[PDB]
């Protein structure tokens, strides 16, 4: 039963290109595919 | 389209080689809801 | 120091042919947010 309130008379400045939950969606999809599509051969550069 | 087996990962920098494709038929029913374009500013069209 | 050696490693896991159908994942906010 989701809770949703419409807020009266409020104005609010957003920003799309500086959201800090887009880098929290990016983390949990790196973490998805690495445990989802396990590959046969990786080639990850180490660069010591 | 193709089906490549040696891709570049989007996750980090690196390549990945996968198994051969599956034997049967492969269906895909996707609904395009978006593009990503890019211009090229010359000096016009 | 400029052309530094980058050892392109190769880790090989055990790779089956697995299914892949993305489900909708919606992000909730913890308590007090």
């Amino acid at each position, epitope marked *: 039963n989701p809770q949703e309130i419409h807020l009266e008379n409020v104005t609010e400045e957003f920003n799309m290109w500086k959201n800090n939950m887009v880098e929290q969606m990016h983390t949990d999809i790196i973490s998805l595919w690495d445990q989802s599509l396990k590959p*046969c*051969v990786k*080639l990850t550069p180490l660069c010591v | 389209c*193709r089906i*490549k*087996q*040696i891709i570049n990962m989007w996750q980090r920098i690196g*390549q990945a*080689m996968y*198994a*051969p494709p599956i034997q049967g038929v492969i269906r895909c029913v996707s609904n395009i809801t978006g593009l990503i374009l890019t211009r090229d500013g010359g000096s016009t069209t | 120091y400029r052309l530094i050696n980058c050892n392109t490693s*190769a880790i*090989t*896991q*055990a*790779c089956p042919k697995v299914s892949f159908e993305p489900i909708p994942i919606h992000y909730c906010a913890p308590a007090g947010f």
Partner: antibody
């Protein structure tokens, strides 16, 4: 990484022989396997070979039909069956393999029928097959 | 049955240079790479030269290789006594669609 083969075999001509080759790795798809033999005192030659990352197999032109290669991924064993046993097959067999990962630096579309057997160093201990 | 024309034996005194030729067509060497393998009689063979000039870890740097035209030369500078084995050159023949070897080259100490 090391490879263990099957036990030595004695036989009569006309039958079919089986030699196994088990890998110590995690999967067979990272290695392009190969079967070479050595008649005692003579040179080396290449019988056949399988690459499971592309599902492709390869046969020498002197050995088509007589030789088949099967690989079981679930047990990580490369199998060789040789049909049409004759006199000169008194030899020792070897299963060898190299890393397949050298074609990731290729020009996008590789070649999925081509040959990527080169400079192996994972030769198993061998199996002596003697016909009578 | 030797498609590659390896000489059957090379010989020199211990502490010198030897050459081993691996001569083939323009569909096994002129387009592809060469390799070299070492086998003591009875024991399993061992790769000694990969990618025409390199050595794996555990190989002395006396073994050198080159690919000239349609043939290849293996050179052992400063021959020791512990090299009592025989050598094989192995390439991929594109026209024959198979890995192709040589007849063998048994080096001998003097």
């Amino acid at each position: 990484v090391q490879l263990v083969q099957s036990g030595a075999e004695v036989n009569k001509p006309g039958s079919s022989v089986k030699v196994s080759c088990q890998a110590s790795g995690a999967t067979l798809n990272s290695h392009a396997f190969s079967w070479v033999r050595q008649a005692p005192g003579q040179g080396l030659e290449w019988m056949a070979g399988i690459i499971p990352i592309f599902g492709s197999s390869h046969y020498a032109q002197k050995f088509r039909g007589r030789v088949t290669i099967s690989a079981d991924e679930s047990t990580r064993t490369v199998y060789l069956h040789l049909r049409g046993l004759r006199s000169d097959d008194t030899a020792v067999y070897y299963c060898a393999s190299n890393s397949i990962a050298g074609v990731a630096a290729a020009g996008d579309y590789a070649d999925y029928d081509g040959g990527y057997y080169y400079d192996m160093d994972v030769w198993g201990q061998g199996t002596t097959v003697t016909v009578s | 049955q030797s498609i590659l024309t390896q000489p059957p034996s090379v010989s020199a005194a211990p502490g010198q240079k030897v050459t081993i030729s691996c001569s083939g067509s323009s569909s096994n060497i002129g387009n592809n790479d060469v390799s070299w393998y070492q086998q003591f009689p009875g024991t399993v063979p061992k790769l000694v030269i990969y990618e025409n000039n390199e050595r794996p870890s555990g190989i002395p740097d006396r073994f050198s290789g080159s690919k000239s035209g349609t043939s290849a030369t293996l050179g052992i500078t400063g021959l020791q006594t512990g090299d009592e084995a025989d050598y094989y050159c192995g390439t991929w023949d594109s026209s024959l669609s198979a890995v192709v070897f040589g007849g063998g080259s048994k080096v001998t100490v003097l």
